[PDB]
Scaffold this active site. Structure first.
Site, PDB file in Angstrom:
ATOM      1  CG  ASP A 157      -2.082   1.030   1.030  1.00  0.00           C
ATOM      2  OD1 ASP A 157      -2.262   1.620  -0.070  1.00  0.00           O
ATOM      3  OD2 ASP A 157      -2.775   1.269   2.039  1.00  0.00           O
ATOM      4  NE  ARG A 161      -3.809   5.387   0.691  1.00  0.00           N
ATOM      5  CZ  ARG A 161      -3.783   5.228  -0.624  1.00  0.00           C
ATOM      6  NH1 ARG A 161      -3.892   6.262  -1.445  1.00  0.00           N
ATOM      7  NH2 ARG A 161      -3.610   4.007  -1.128  1.00  0.00           N
ATOM      8  CG  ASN A 162      -0.176   4.326   3.700  1.00  0.00           C
ATOM      9  OD1 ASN A 162      -0.823   4.819   4.625  1.00  0.00           O
ATOM     10  ND2 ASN A 162      -0.671   3.374   2.904  1.00  0.00           N
ATOM     11  CG  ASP A 175      -1.098   1.116   7.211  1.00  0.00           C
ATOM     12  OD1 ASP A 175      -1.035  -0.075   7.600  1.00  0.00           O
ATOM     13  OD2 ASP A 175      -2.179   1.658   6.934  1.00  0.00           O
TER      14      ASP A 175
HETATM   15  C1  LIG Z   1      -2.394  15.417  11.550  1.00  0.00           C
HETATM   16  N1  LIG Z   1      -1.231  14.587  11.862  1.00  0.00           N
HETATM   17  C2  LIG Z   1      -1.134  13.251  11.721  1.00  0.00           C
HETATM   18  C3  LIG Z   1       0.119  12.903  12.202  1.00  0.00           C
HETATM   19  C4  LIG Z   1       0.687  11.554  12.357  1.00  0.00           C
HETATM   20  C5  LIG Z   1       0.118  10.336  11.852  1.00  0.00           C
HETATM   21  C6  LIG Z   1       0.960   9.301  12.201  1.00  0.00           C
HETATM   22  C7  LIG Z   1       0.953   7.881  12.027  1.00  0.00           C
HETATM   23  N2  LIG Z   1       0.005   7.208  11.320  1.00  0.00           N
HETATM   24  C8  LIG Z   1      -1.427   7.368  11.593  1.00  0.00           C
HETATM   25  C9  LIG Z   1      -2.247   6.746  10.492  1.00  0.00           C
HETATM   26  N3  LIG Z   1      -1.985   5.310  10.383  1.00  0.00           N
HETATM   27  C10 LIG Z   1      -2.980   4.406  10.368  1.00  0.00           C
HETATM   28  N4  LIG Z   1      -4.222   4.870  10.549  1.00  0.00           N
HETATM   29  C11 LIG Z   1      -5.188   3.948  10.552  1.00  0.00           C
HETATM   30  C12 LIG Z   1      -4.950   2.598  10.367  1.00  0.00           C
HETATM   31  C13 LIG Z   1      -6.041   1.528  10.323  1.00  0.00           C
HETATM   32  C14 LIG Z   1      -7.435   2.146  10.455  1.00  0.00           C
HETATM   33  N5  LIG Z   1      -6.007   0.860   9.011  1.00  0.00           N
HETATM   34  C15 LIG Z   1      -5.812   0.507  11.439  1.00  0.00           C
HETATM   35  C16 LIG Z   1      -5.640   0.939  12.749  1.00  0.00           C
HETATM   36  C17 LIG Z   1      -5.443   0.038  13.780  1.00  0.00           C
HETATM   37  C18 LIG Z   1      -5.416  -1.296  13.477  1.00  0.00           C
HETATM   38  F1  LIG Z   1      -5.226  -2.186  14.488  1.00  0.00           F
HETATM   39  C19 LIG Z   1      -5.573  -1.773  12.201  1.00  0.00           C
HETATM   40  C20 LIG Z   1      -5.773  -0.859  11.181  1.00  0.00           C
HETATM   41  C21 LIG Z   1      -3.624   2.246  10.195  1.00  0.00           C
HETATM   42  N6  LIG Z   1      -2.625   3.128  10.193  1.00  0.00           N
HETATM   43  C22 LIG Z   1      -0.639   4.915  10.807  1.00  0.00           C
HETATM   44  C23 LIG Z   1       0.359   6.009  10.556  1.00  0.00           C
HETATM   45  N7  LIG Z   1       1.942   7.136  12.542  1.00  0.00           N
HETATM   46  C24 LIG Z   1       2.900   7.814  13.194  1.00  0.00           C
HETATM   47  N8  LIG Z   1       3.036   9.127  13.420  1.00  0.00           N
HETATM   48  N9  LIG Z   1       2.007   9.873  12.891  1.00  0.00           N
HETATM   49  C25 LIG Z   1       1.870  11.219  12.996  1.00  0.00           C
HETATM   50  C26 LIG Z   1       0.695  14.120  12.593  1.00  0.00           C
HETATM   51  N10 LIG Z   1      -0.122  15.140  12.384  1.00  0.00           N
END
Ligand SMILES: Cn1cc(-c2cc3c(N4CCN(c5ncc([C@@](C)(N)c6ccc(F)cc6)cn5)CC4)ncnn3c2)cn1
Length: 296
Positions: A157, A161-162, A175
């Site tokens: 992925d 966005r990642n 992610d």
């Molecule tokens: C405005 N702003 C934002 C940041 C920010 C954002 C991250 C970050 N992320 C967050 C987003 N991500 C993410 N969201 C959802 C999933 C799910 C829904 N699919 C999921 C969740 C739990 C689960 F058990 C299974 C699936 C996965 N991943 C990871 C990366 N990581 C670190 N620092 N950081 C800093 C800083 N300012």
């Protein structure tokens, strides 16, 4: 079969990662979905006994099926086996009892690159975002994926966005929920039934559910287009429908984005070869971009 590939998800969880969950204080939600969420948190005494540290914490909801809990643990085990790299969001710890499983990773204070590019879009010039920044981001992401590929892992992925941004203009791949070790088979065939990032997917992934090192490279090409368009959606105005799949199969490719150097669009074109074998490797991409950086 006296020699075999060590499946990192079969290895025991290493309790060196364990951290008390009552030393975490949760803050704003960073991402959310049906299965769980990732929240900002303060970790008291995580690296240094007397210091608080901002982290991200990934968690499932209590309603999460047994399949989801094992998958989060498998992600944890992949990250533990991968080891540390500058250009990935690194594992810092885990909470595997006292409540839902928590995976503690680095926090990237500037958030995802897609939203970052869209903010800096108005003030971009070739704290102003420049072409030098874009070349650096392309280089750092290629370095991160070369690392993953060198560990026989695919992300599946890759997209702006990642990719997250932290201090010092460092970009980190995030992610790893769908990341797989493909040592044994040289590919991965997805048996799942989830929503998929169609506009980032290689045609063999769309049509045959096949995922490889080469399909990650396809996605990287799309990421480059996002980057040098300052965050435009790929294939603008084209819905994902019958015509979209037909055009991709027949060879339609996005044109060069507004700010892409010719040498960078050359990379995207090769990343999007219909023949996976003609796509570059990430090791080749790193070298190519390294040359472009040194020529200013
Ligand atoms: C405005 N702003 C934002 C940041 C920010 C954002 C991250 C970050 N992320 C967050 C987003 N991500 C993410 N969201 C959802 C999933 C799910 C829904 N699919 C999921 C969740 C739990 C689960 F058990 C299974 C699936 C996965 N991943 C990871 C990366 N990581 C670190 N620092 N950081 C800093 C800083 N300012």
């Amino acid at each position: 079969n006296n020699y075999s590939y060590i499946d990192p998800t079969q290895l025991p969880y290493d309790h060196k990662w364990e951290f008390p969950r009552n030393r975490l204080s949760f803050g704003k939600t960073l991402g959310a979905g049906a299965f769980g969420k990732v929240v900002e948190a303060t970790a008291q005494g995580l690296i240094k006994s007397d210091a608080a540290m901002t982290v991200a914490v990934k968690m499932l909801k209590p309603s999460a099926h047994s399949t989801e809990r094992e998958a989060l643990m498998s992600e944890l085990k992949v990250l533990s086996y991968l080891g540390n790299h500058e250009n990935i969001v690194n594992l810092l710890g885990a909470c595997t009892h006292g409540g839902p499983t928590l995976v503690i990773t680095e926090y990237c204070c500037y958030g995802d690159l897609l939203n970052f590019l869209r903010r800096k879009r108005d003030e971009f010039v070739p704290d102003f975002l420049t072409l030098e920044h874009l070349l650096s981001f392309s280089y750092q992401v290629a370095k991160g994926m070369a690392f993953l590929a060198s560990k026989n892992c695919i992300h599946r992925d890759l997209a702006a966005r990642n990719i997250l941004l932290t201090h010092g203009n460092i970009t980190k791949i995030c992610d790893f929920g769908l990341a797989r070790d493909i040592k044994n088979d040289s590919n991965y065939v997805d048996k799942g039934n989830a929503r998929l990032p169609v506009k980032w997917m290689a045609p063999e992934s769309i049509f045959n559910s096949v995922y490889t090192f080469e399909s990650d490279v396809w996605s990287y090409g799309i990421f480059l287009w996002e980057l040098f368009s300052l965050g435009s959606s790929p294939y603008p105005g084209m819905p994902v429908d019958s015509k979209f799949y037909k055009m991709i199969k027949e060879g339609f490719r996005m044109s060069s984005p507004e700010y892409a150097p010719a040498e960078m669009y050359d990379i995207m074109k090769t990343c999007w070869d219909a023949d996976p074998d003609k796509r570059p490797t990430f090791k080749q991409i790193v070298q190519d971009i390294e040359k472009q950086i040194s020529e200013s």
